[PDB]
């Protein structure tokens, strides 16, 4: 009964109330496509698993007295304020803030959790210090044995953990961000401090980081299993072991991995679904994204389901945590036509023609091959 | 100076020899696309890493006294001779045999190790008794700590060990393997007993089977780490983590994964790089696989620079360990023209662009889209 601007100030009126205990609201996909460049805070998706109490809200948060540790597998362990950040160097990166579970309901049979369309997606712009820069500044040495970075969400107001494994290579790009998009990082979005893995789904973009710590092995709480991850032969050269849909599956440390890397993937942005549209040359726009390791190659589309697809020019051609924007322009006679968009990266991954193959009880990382059904006048 | 048929007799004397101590033997690329089917043992190439003394022909070797040891995490650890083989249900699978090094030498710089261009490929079929069959007969349970299959070589003649761990997912298709193509395992092939692993890089195939083990982590002989590894993000959905060309990598267990699942491909085997083919219409041929986990979706070929793919005709369409054939006929005009082709599976995996993204420096699992040159009268 609520609407998203009564369970977070300053929210889109319009916004999807997926949850309100906690915290689950999706952008409407024709207003997502309305902001091709960036996602801005007033329609930008939320994902809470843990809301904290009073930062339900786009307004920023004070850092005041806001205390973050950082241990384990360091030489040093220390505790810094988040005041401090504000004299040290800053950076800022464009990235895709994706849920793990956006695409849910496309997968069939329906799947346990948020039944997220495409709208649990946003690009974005955070600024803060690298995590690498503040070890650099403290004076303080990564143990050998570091294999993860393992991060804590603050648990004022009496909240629940929030506790999220990544891999240590993700130090390289580790941003503790007090800005998104210019402005003060929302509380709802986790200000007054989030730690942010660019290219790495949302579920590992902690909110209101209180601990950061250097971790031997994945931490063992509920949230990292066996939760977020989907099936796989671990440290195998497959994207996921494909299971049968509708069939439960027995997750352990060492059948199953992690959602980490945000999965190859195309939307289509115009024509939207059901759509009437002119003339013989039809432009169909959309976005495209991967996990910021390598560029794209291509972009493809195909109207004749597959037989031929045809490469779309691209905003830019350099690798990008954010997303990038595509066109092709197709000659179409009038009737009924299927535009299908596939995205092609440096490492030779793309996308299932199927999605449903990766189907996951708790419906995770969907990224399969968009299809849109529109008329040409 | 000894051609191949000196070293290995048996073998048709056009194999290039790349080594003489171990045994390294490559088919040359006219003669394999003269095999769209099944390639023989007159022509298949060899890699020894370590050469058992006696073994270098193509003429099958008794199984008499030939005693294989199973332990490690099973309740029952036993000792069984081939023999006993004879007597159980017996299963075949065609598959892709392909050596780790396979396109070596298309890497720049040159990396290390034996100079394959394509022929350190075939596709045979193997007969024997799946080891879930023998370790079912002897009444035998996996214990649940068991993640590795751990094979051991015959040490035989005072051979060097030879000791590779595949994941414990492989037991589902594992293969002991007694008869290549129909007839008794070639000795050179690993007579008289192979375990094989369908989908998995030829290093993994333990020919001259001793130990079968069944361990908690992956063996730490050479052979296992820091050789047959590339570059990687462990448990992360990326093929392997790119490095800059000509640049030494310090391998351990957690930076980088083994050579275990066969990497999609797709091979031209018609037209030949610079033959002149006549009329408008090209019928271009090849072969395309991945590790068989699941079925290709599309091979696809381009003439002009990968702005358009197209669909070719697949021979089959359900999964296999094997290769499948493809055409694609273009319309072409008279004079110099390209084709490139690339393969697409069900989870979305496909070939880098450009495979040179993917060096490292053992020069592993290249898997570039291959591009070939000719004209068109
Ligand atoms: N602290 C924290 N953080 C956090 C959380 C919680 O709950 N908490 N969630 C997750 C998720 S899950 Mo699924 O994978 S997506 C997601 C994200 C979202 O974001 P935004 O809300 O800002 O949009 O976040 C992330 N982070
Ligand atoms: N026992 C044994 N096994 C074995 C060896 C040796 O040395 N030893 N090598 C490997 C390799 S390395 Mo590279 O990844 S390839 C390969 C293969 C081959 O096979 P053939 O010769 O039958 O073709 O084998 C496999 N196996």
């Given at each position: 009964?609520?609407?998203?601007?009564?369970?977070?100030?300053?929210?889109?009126?319009?916004?999807?109330v997926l949850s309100q205990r906690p915290i689950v609201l999706e952008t409407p996909y024709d207003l997502l496509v309305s902001q091709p460049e960036r996602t801005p805070k007033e329609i930008l998706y939320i994902r809470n698993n843990v809301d904290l109490p009073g930062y339900n809200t786009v307004e920023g948060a004070s850092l005041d007295g806001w205390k973050v540790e950082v241990g384990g597998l360091v030489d040093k362990p220390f505790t810094f304020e988040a005041k401090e950040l504000l004299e040290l160097p800053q950076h800022e990166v464009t990235m895709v803030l994706q849920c793990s579970g956006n695409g849910r309901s496309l997968f069939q049979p329906r799947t346990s959790g948020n039944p997220w369309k495409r709208g649990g997606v946003g690009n974005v712009t955070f600024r803060g210090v690298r995590l690498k820069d503040l070890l650099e500044a403290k004076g303080v040495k990564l143990g050998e044995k570091a294999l993860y970075i393992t991060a804590h969400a603050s648990r004022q107001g009496n909240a629940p953990e929030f506790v999220r494994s990544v891999p240590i290579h993700a130090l390289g790009h580790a941003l503790l961000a007090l800005s998104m998009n210019g402005?003060?990082?929302?509380?709802?979005?986790?200000?007054?401090?989030?730690?942010?893995?660019?290219?790495?789904?949302?579920?590992?973009?902690?909110?209101?980081?209180?601990?950061?710590?250097?971790?031997?092995?994945?931490?063992?709480?509920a949230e990292q299993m066996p939760r977020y991850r989907v099936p796989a032969i671990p440290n195998a050269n497959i994207p996921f072991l494909p299971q049968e849909p509708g069939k439960t599956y027995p997750y352990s440390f060492t059948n199953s991995r992690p959602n980490w890397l945000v999965a190859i993937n195309s939307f289509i942005f115009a024509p939207l679904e059901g759509q009437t549209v002119e003339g013989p040359y039809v432009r169909v726009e959309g976005v495209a994204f991967n996990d910021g390791i390598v560029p794209l190659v291509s972009v493809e589309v195909s109207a004749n389901g597959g037989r031929t697809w045809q490469q779309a020019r691209l905003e830019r051609q350099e690798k990008s945590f954010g997303w990038?924007?595509?066109?092709?322009?197709?000659?179409?006679?009038?009737?009924?036509?299927?535009?299908?968009?596939?995205?092609?990266?440096?490492?030779?991954?793309?996308?299932?023609?199927?999605?449903?193959?990766?189907?996951?009880?708790?419906?995770?990382?969907?990224?399969?091959?968009?299809?849109?059904?529109?008329?040409?006048?």
């Open positions: 009964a609520p609407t998203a601007d009564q369970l977070v100030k300053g929210k889109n009126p319009k916004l999807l402005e003060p990082l929302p509380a709802v979005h986790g200000g007054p401090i989030r730690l942010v893995f660019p290219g790495y789904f949302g579920v590992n973009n902690v909110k209101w980081v209180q601990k950061i710590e250097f971790t031997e092995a994945e931490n063992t709480t990038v924007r595509w066109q092709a322009t197709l000659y179409l006679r009038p009737g009924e036509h299927e535009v299908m968009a596939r995205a092609w990266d440096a490492v030779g991954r793309s996308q299932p023609l199927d999605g449903n193959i990766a189907w996951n009880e708790r419906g995770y990382e969907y990224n399969g091959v968009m299809r849109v059904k529109f008329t040409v006048a």
